[PDB]
Amino acid sequence: KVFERCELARTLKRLGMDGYRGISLANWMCLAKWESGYNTRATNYNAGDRSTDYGIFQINSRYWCNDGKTPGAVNACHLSCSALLQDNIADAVACAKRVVRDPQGIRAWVAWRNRCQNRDVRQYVQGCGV
């Protein structure tokens, strides 16, 4: 599914993302926007290490989820990557929280660094009632 902006902000807020690890809801929204376009079915294949990025937060199959076809798989989230291609985003939200647990935090996502880091992100939560 493709979430509408405010629909997603309210869902992310209900799932405890706002201020999670010092990360504002607006920053999480910006990440989702540039990673997938708020799309739970987004996928991206990386020919270099043969990994795939999955779902709304584009979680990678090498370190975080198991897709069963990626070399050097760690499965740090202990989740099948297919669980991150679902309309219900609880698993995706939890795995995104696991990514930011690491020292790098939300800087792990290159797109967040190129589009959201040091960017006014007020528009992502404006008028959503969050």
Epitope: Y20, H78, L79, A90, D91, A94, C95, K97, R98
Partner: nanobody, 121 residues
């Protein structure tokens, strides 16, 4: 964040059953029970992932202990059947918002105060 409160601890005779409860004041993804027997290091017992209801048990209690959830009351339960003297311990409820191996102590961020379970004879 999330505060956890356990209850149901008590003294039971060997072979008996006991059910512990744990309430959470906010949303949790994974919840589990970690016990500390007298003089020993704390160890994992059982865990549950709330999204799909999958459950994970330590080899020492697998088959005997079962963990469940009541999503309406936001509570988790640890049912223990066929208790042994060796199950005597302070049982702690813990939770996290992160996805990881549910019996990995390192992913847990929220901890209760513990509820004592004593198994005699």
């Amino acid at each position: 964040q999330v505060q956890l409160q356990e209850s149901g601890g008590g003294s039971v005779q060997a072979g008996g059953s006991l059910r512990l409860s744990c309430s959470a004041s906010g949303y949790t993804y994974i919840s589990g029970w970690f016990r500390q027997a007298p003089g020993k290091e704390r160890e994992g017992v059982a865990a549950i992932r709330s999204s799909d209801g999958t459950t994970y048990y330590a080899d020492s209690v697998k088959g005997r202990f079962t963990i469940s959830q009541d999503n309406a009351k936001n509570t988790v339960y640890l049912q223990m059947n066929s208790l042994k003297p060796e199950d005597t311990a302070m049982y702690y409820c813990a939770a996290t918002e992160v996805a990881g191996w549910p019996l990995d102590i390192g992913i847990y961020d929220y901890w209760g105060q513990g509820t004592e379970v004593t198994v005699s004879s």
